[PDB]
């Protein structure tokens, strides 16, 4: 079994600009069966690149493959705004055929902050016996932050879940919302909820919080 | 130019079997090879299987290997993806890619095919307002089955500042969402903000008012 390893993990630029991504196998691939593909968030993938180097019919001009063997490129000369996607290395050499982990190609933008805001459970779902307090970080640039959850400053893990947006198109940022669930007694068994943000649009940590009732 | 149709999505309990149609029109090649890939949710691509149904050749993934056939009547083009013995990790977005002339160079997929494998059966979403704080607030649509939901806000007359996000899966195998909207702080105790959340599977729309309390 061959495995496949592309480089960077995402990759951050802007329309007009060369995008170079990589595809490093643990063995060598016949010759050169190597293929890159395209995919959109929710759609279905699309063949780029065949045998390493050779552009499948309909596919733009900017598009081109290079290197074989162990060691594989793929290169887009001047970014368009429909670029923008992940980009899966496949070989096409020995079974099981396999894929990458993939790269996204995101718009770069300048550091934007996250707007805090937390929400409190409604008083609808106290009644059915468990609370929800949402955590919502709004319109933020990187995608790297940290949520820390806090009880009375016992620090919380396990019991949240998180989730983040595609990067918008109106202003190339993320937005993610996390999830604090317990029970109706453990919500009141406490006083102080807060949610500790950390990311690099940020001097410090932000702490945003309220007392139940 | 030829036509991928895929099977209705579907929800199956564990250890039972799905069975998977992909349904294909035009294109002269009437020599093609059928690949089957899948995709778990936030996961990267997965080769499963390929056929070639004329020859009658098959191959298929290390992996699955004797859960997995792929079968074709080329009668009416359609080919066919039966994965048994299910487990909760085969939870996945499956796609059926043909690939025609010579080297393989026309790419054709399927619309793909959701197979949600749980334990849990279909359930109605419970909407939960989150109150606000531009002022942020949003909706909860907590703990259904299966996906996918859809949300809207003043059936679709507030589009402007709106993030769905990504469901995530509870421990209870049930789903749960939140949506967010940025308002004008000014508007708050003057305009009605109600969200629309349609869960197509459980048969189920409900409406609910958001506001302060």
């Known amino acids: 079994e061959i495995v496949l390893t592309q480089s960077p993990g995402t990759l951050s630029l802007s329309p007009g600009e060369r995008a170079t991504l990589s595809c490093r196998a643990s063995?060598?691939?016949?010759?050169?069966?190597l293929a890159w593909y395209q995919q959109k968030p929710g759609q279905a993938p699309r063949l780029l690149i065949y045998?390493?180097?050779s552009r499948a019919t309909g596919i733009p001009d900017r598009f081109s493959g290079s290197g074989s063997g162990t060691d594989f490129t793929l290169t887009i000369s001047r970014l368009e705004p429909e670029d923008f996607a992940v980009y899966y290395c496949?070989?096409?050499?020995?079974?099981?055929?396999?894929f990458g982990q993939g790269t996204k190609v995101e718009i770069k933008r300048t550091v934007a902050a996250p707007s805090v805001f937390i929400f409190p459970p409604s008083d609808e779902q106290l009644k059915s016996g468990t609370a929800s307090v949402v955590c919502l970080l709004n319109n933020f640039y990187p995608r790297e932050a940290k949520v820390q959850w806090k009880v009375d400053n016992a620090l919380q893990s396990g019991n949240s879940q998180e989730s983040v947006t595609e990067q918008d198109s109106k202003d190339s940022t993320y937005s993610l919302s996390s999830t604090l669930t317990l029970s109706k007694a453990d919500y009141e068994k406490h006083k102080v909820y807060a949610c500790e943000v950390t990311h690099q649009g940020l001097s410090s940590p932000v702490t945003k919080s309220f007392n139940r009732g | 130019q030829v036509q991928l149709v895929q099977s209705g999505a579907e929800v199956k309990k564990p250890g039972s079997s799905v069975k998977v149609s992909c349904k294909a029109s035009?294109?002269?090649?009437?020599?093609?090879?059928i690949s089957w890939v899948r995709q778990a949710p936030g996961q990267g691509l997965e080769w499963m299987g390929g056929?070639?149904?004329?020859?009658?050749?098959?191959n298929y993934a290390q992996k699955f290997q004797g859960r997995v056939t792929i079968t074709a009547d080329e009668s009416t083009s359609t080919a066919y993806m039966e994965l048994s013995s299910l487990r909760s990790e085969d939870t996945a977005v499956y796609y059926c890619?043909?690939?025609?002339?010579?080297?393989?160079?026309?790419?054709?997929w399927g619309q793909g095919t959701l197979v949600t494998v749980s334990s849990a059966s279909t359930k109605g979403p419970s909407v939960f307002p989150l109150a606000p704080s531009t002022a942020a607030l949003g909706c909860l649509v907590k703990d259904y089955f299966p996906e996918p939901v859809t949300v809207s806000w003043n059936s679709g007359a507030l589009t402007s500042g709106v993030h769905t996000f990504p469901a995530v899966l509870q421990s209870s195998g049930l789903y749960s969402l939140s949506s967010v909207v940025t308002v004008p702080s000014s508007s708050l105790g003057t305009q009605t903000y109600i969200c629309n959340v349609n869960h197509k599977p459980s048969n189920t729309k409900v409406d609910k008012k958001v506001e302060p309390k």
């Open positions: 890619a043909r690939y025609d002339g010579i080297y393989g160079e026309l790419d054709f």
């Open positions: 035009g294109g002269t090649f009437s020599s093609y090879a």
């Open positions: 056929i070639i149904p004329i020859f009658g050749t098959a």
């Open positions: 063995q060598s691939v016949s010759s050169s069966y």
């Open positions: 045998g390493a180097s």
């Open positions: 496949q070989q096409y050499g020995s079974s099981p055929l396999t």
